[PDB]
């Protein structure tokens, strides 16, 4: 095929077939010319060489290209390899109706959706847009529909709303390791050019927000849409396949928020008072009268499926903090209050969702995780957590441990200098005492910082 | 033979940073190449038992 600038482009196959034809015809001519045996044997060897270079280049002299120093792509070179038609075409292939972009956060999303830019969704769903426009009679013919979208008339945005509502999309990250590397979400039209991925799924994607880009695909046929909604849906995939542990576990900010919420200090505003329940705790906190963390007793209503599967409910006066009382409002019916009476580390913020799924099922566990992420981000913002130069402890014992260590090193230098301790033994002993000093400084700073308060 | 006696809260000097550079390079190289080796292992594992 001709290329730009009058130059032509061709596969090197043509050169190899050319040599084969040339040398075969020259051999036929030498046969008709009654050539000596040396020449015809040379020509048979050369024809063998050419045919072998055509079939599979590499087991022979590796015929050079024409004016190009690299070898020529043969047929076996076309087939085999990581770039042959097997690895690069048949197993994996480029796909239409697809795109990609940098990703952003979009925390306001519920779990079963993602933020999709307008221009990407427009370029993607073009055929469905044309079909819907000409079905509703808004376009005379398909050419007119393409003209309408190329003009980007204001009416087509509602048609895109119609075609996007129940049509899931597939999101994938570049390092695909497990099946959760691809997940189905519901499109949410977003102004901008960035994809908004639900944060709880980032752990499944190993996707940082450090510039990582993700790709999107559109299930065309009905079977593909149903496979996306029933199998690849983000809500349907919460437990990891490698192990029953959840993969939707809150990651960093929400874990912090819930940790700062559920916690007890020795004293704060209104310690030890009593409240009718969690709603009173919210009224107390939001008005600034009571602190978030304070040792309190409150009446709470917990629920227990009991004795036949029939749901029973019991109220009691529980020892807790205001934060745990406020958090209890989110907890679905069946769970016991004991789960929110601890300090709520990440390890336990996972077991909470685990027990929720094991008891109440998938349908509640999803909305539970959604509300968990919402309240975690909200209260991590409200907390005002930060990090300063003074937030780092420096024990004054540190220099005393350093001084004792270096006095010991000058002692051992005395002893080793006057040929008493051997070389390797003294070196190992220096190593051991330095490790011990490191452990000492670590324990000193840790005891200074951990219960400093 | 002489562990670092500094923290990032304080200011490191030339020797300590120059010695930490060794481990930094070692570990970053381990990551960068081990990821490809791990993908290779994943490919072998799918090919042996996928049918």
């Amino acid at each position: 095929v001709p290329l730009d600038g009058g130059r032509f482009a061709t596969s090197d196959l043509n050169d190899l077939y050319r040599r084969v034809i040339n040398r075969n015809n020259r051999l036929k001519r030498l046969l008709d010319l009654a050539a000596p045996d040396i020449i015809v044997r040379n020509e048979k060897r050369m024809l063998q060489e050419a045919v072998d270079a055509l079939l599979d280049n590499g087991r022979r002299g590796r015929a050079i290209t024409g004016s190009n120093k690299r070898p020529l792509k043969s047929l076996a070179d076309m087939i085999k390899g990581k770039q042959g038609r097997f690895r690069q075409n048949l197993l994996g292939k480029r796909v239409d109706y697809s795109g990609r972009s940098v990703i952003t956060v979009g925390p306001y999303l519920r779990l079963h959706q993602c933020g999709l830019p307008k221009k990407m969704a427009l370029e993607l769903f073009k055929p469905f847009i044309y079909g819907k426009l000409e079905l509703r009679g808004l376009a005379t013919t398909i050419k007119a529909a393409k003209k309408m979208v190329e003009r980007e008339e204001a009416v087509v945005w509602d048609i895109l709303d119609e075609v996007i509502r129940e049509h899931p999309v597939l999101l994938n990250r570049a390092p695909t390791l497990h099946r959760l590397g691809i997940q189905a979400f519901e499109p949410v039209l977003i102004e901008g050019k960035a994809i908004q991925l639900h944060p709880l799924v980032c752990a499944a994607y190993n996707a940082d927000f450090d510039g990582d880009q993700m790709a999107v695909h559109v299930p065309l046929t009905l079977e593909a849409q149903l496979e996306a909604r029933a199998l690849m849906m983000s809500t349907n995939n919460i437990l990891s396949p490698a192990n029953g542990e959840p993969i939707i576990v809150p990651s960093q900010d929400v874990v912090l928020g819930l940790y700062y919420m559920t916690r007890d200090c020795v004293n704060a505003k209104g310690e030890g008072m009593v409240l009718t329940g969690p709603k009173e705790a919210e009224r107390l906190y939001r008005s600034g009268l009571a602190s978030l963390h304070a040792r309190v007793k409150v009446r709470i209503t917990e629920y227990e499926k009991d004795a036949n599967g029939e749901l029973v409910a019991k109220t009691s006066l529980k020892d807790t903090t205001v934060g745990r009382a406020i958090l209890w409002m989110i907890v679905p019916k069946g769970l016991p209050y004991s789960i929110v009476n601890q300090a709520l580390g990440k390890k336990a913020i996972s077991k909470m969702l685990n027990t929720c799924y094991r008891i109440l099922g998938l349908k509640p566990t999803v909305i539970f995780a959604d509300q968990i992420m919402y309240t975690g981000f909200a209260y991590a913002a409200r907390s005002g957590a930060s990090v300063g130069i003074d937030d780092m402890v420096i024990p004054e014992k540190k220099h005393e441990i350093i001084s004792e260590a270096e006095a010991e090193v000058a002692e051992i230098q005395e002893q080793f200098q006057s040929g008493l301790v051997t070389a390797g033994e003294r070196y190992n002993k220096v190593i051991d005492i330095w490790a011990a000093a490191n452990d000492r400084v670590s324990k000193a700073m840790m005891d200074n910082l951990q219960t400093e308060t | 033979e002489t562990p670092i006696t500094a923290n990032f809260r304080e200011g490191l000097n030339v020797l300590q940073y120059f010695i930490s550079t060794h481990g930094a390079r070692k570990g970053l190289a381990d990551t960068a190449l081990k990821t490809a080796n791990s993908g290779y292992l994943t490919r072998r594992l799918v090919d042996v038992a996928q049918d």
Binding site: D208, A435, N438, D439 | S20, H22, G23, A24, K26, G27, L28, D30, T31
Partner: peptide, 21 residues
């Protein structure tokens, strides 16, 4: 330390190994 994205070259021997961000 933790949150494995780069390894921790500096540790006492025997610790599993970080795997630090």
């Amino acid at each position: 330390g933790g949150a494995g994205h780069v390894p921790e070259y500096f540790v006492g021997i025997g610790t599993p190994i970080s795997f630090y961000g």
